[PDB]
Symmetry: none
Subunit: 90 residues, 10 copies
């Protein structure tokens, strides 16, 4: 007998994130769980899994990556529940 | 006997995110769960899974990636439930 | 006997996101679940899965990617339920 | 008999993050759990899993990565629930 | 008989992070748990898992990595729940 | 027993007179609300009765007060003479 | 027993007179609220009664007060003469 | 027993007179609220009664007060003569 | 027994007179609130009664007070003559 | 027994008179609150009663006071004559 009990009774005014998981029993992936609460911000990726035998013979390649600019990211209360408070971005 | 019990009784005024999962028993993927609560912001990807034998022989390639500009991202309360509060972006 | 019980009784004024999943038992994908609550903002992708043997022989390629401009994204309460509060974007 | 009991009774106004997991019994991955609460900010990756035998013979390659620019990231209360407080970004 | 009991009764206004795990019984990975609460900020990676026999014979390579620019990261209360306090970033 | 109030008046006065000569919830022999003013008064769940919600009672009570309400009153319970009372908006 | 109040008046006065001559919740023989003013008064759960919520009672009580409310009062319980009372917005 | 108040008046005065001549919750023979002013008063759970919440009672009580409220009062319980009372916004 | 107050008046005064001649919660023979002012008063859980929360009682009591509230009062319980009372914002 | 107060007045004065001639919680024969002012007063859990929270009682009491509150009062219980009372913001 397997019994999972999460947050039986709630009677206030909470701010709650819940995640309950129960299990019983070039690239390869199998029977996984990923990114339940994932925040990806300004994520880069240039070359990935190009394939089998890229640029096999006599290949001349020039690679350049210039990340250069005025960028502004302003975040308040990321992944953070709250209650009876004041979140202000002035 | 498998029994899962999540948030039986609620009688206030909450702000709740729930996610309940139950299971019983070039690129390859099989029987997974992904991105239940996923926030992807300003995500880039240039070359991926081009195929089998790209640019096999005598291939001349010039690659350039210029990320350059005035960009502004303003987010308040990302993935964060709240109650009885004040979220303001002035 | 498998029994799943989520949010049996609710008698207030909540703001709730629910997601319940029950299971019993070049690119390949099989029997998955994806993007139940997915927010993709300003996501780019240039080359992907071009096919089998692109640019096989004697291929001259010039690649350029210029991301450059004044862009403004303003979001309040992303993926965040709330109650009895004040969300204002002035 | 396996019994898991998490947060039986709640009657105040808390801010709670929960994550409960129960289990009973070039690249390869199998039966894992990843990124339940993962925050990836300004993460880069240039070359990864290019494939089998890239640049096999007589390959001339020039690689350059210039990360150079005025960037500003401002975050308050990352992955941190709170209550009865004041989070302000002026 | 295995019984796990975490946070039976809560009646104040706390700020709590919980993570409960129960288990009963080129690159390879198997039956692990990773990144339950992982914060990756300004993480770089240039070459990784290029494949089998890259640059096998007569390979001329020039590698350069220039990380050079005015960058500002300002974070308050990272991975730190709090209550009845004042978090301000002026 | 002799009582005299304002026996002679010759001036045009504004007078507000009140003369009285005497020789669960239970009240008796009371004189209530002589010149009583009651503005914007509330009452929730008054005098429910005997034995309410005796057994296994679940109650969720929520009272909310809000909204733009504007009360403008001049000269409350105040007689006046030879004056000027103006309420201009 | 002799009582005299304002026997002679000759000036046009503003007078507010109150003369009185005497020779669970229980109240008796009281004189309540003579010139009583009651503005913006609240009361939650008053005098529920005998034996309320006796056994196994669950109660969630939440009272909220808010909202733009503007009260503007001039000359409360204050007679005036030969003056000027103005409420200008 | 002789009482005299303001026997002769000749000036146009603003007078506020109050003359009195005498020869669970229980109150008796009281004189309450003569010129009583009650503004913005609250009361939560007053006089519930006999034996409330006797056994196994769960109560979550939350009271919140907030909101833009503006009270502007001039000349409370204060008679005036030959003056100027102005409330200008 | 002789009492004399303000027998002769000839000036137009602002007078606030109060003359009195005498010859669980229990109160008796009291004179309460003669010229009583009560502004912004609170009361939580007053006089619940006999035997409240007798056995195995769980109570979570939270009281919050906040919000922009502005009280502007001039000349409280203060008669005036030949003056100028102004409340300008 | 002879008492004389302000027998002759000829100047237009601002007078605030109060003359008195005499010949669980229990109070008796008291004179309370003659010219009593009560501003911003609080009271939590007053007079719960006989035998509250007798056995195995769990109580979590939290009281919070905050918020922008502005009180501006001029001339409290202070009669004035031939003057100027101004409240300017």
């Amino acid at each position: 007998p397997l019994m999972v009990k999460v947050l039986d009774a709630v009677r206030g005014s909470p701010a709650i994130n819940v995640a309950v998981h129960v299990f019983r029993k070039l690239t390869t992936e199998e029977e996984f769980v990923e990114g339940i609460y994932k925040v990806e911000i300004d994520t880069k990726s240039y070359w990935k899994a190009l394939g089998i035998s890229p640029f096999h013979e006599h290949a001349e390649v020039v690679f350049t990556a210039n990340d250069s600019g005025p960028r502004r990211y302003t975040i308040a209360a990321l992944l953070s529940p709250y209650s009876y408070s004041t979140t202000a971005v002035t």
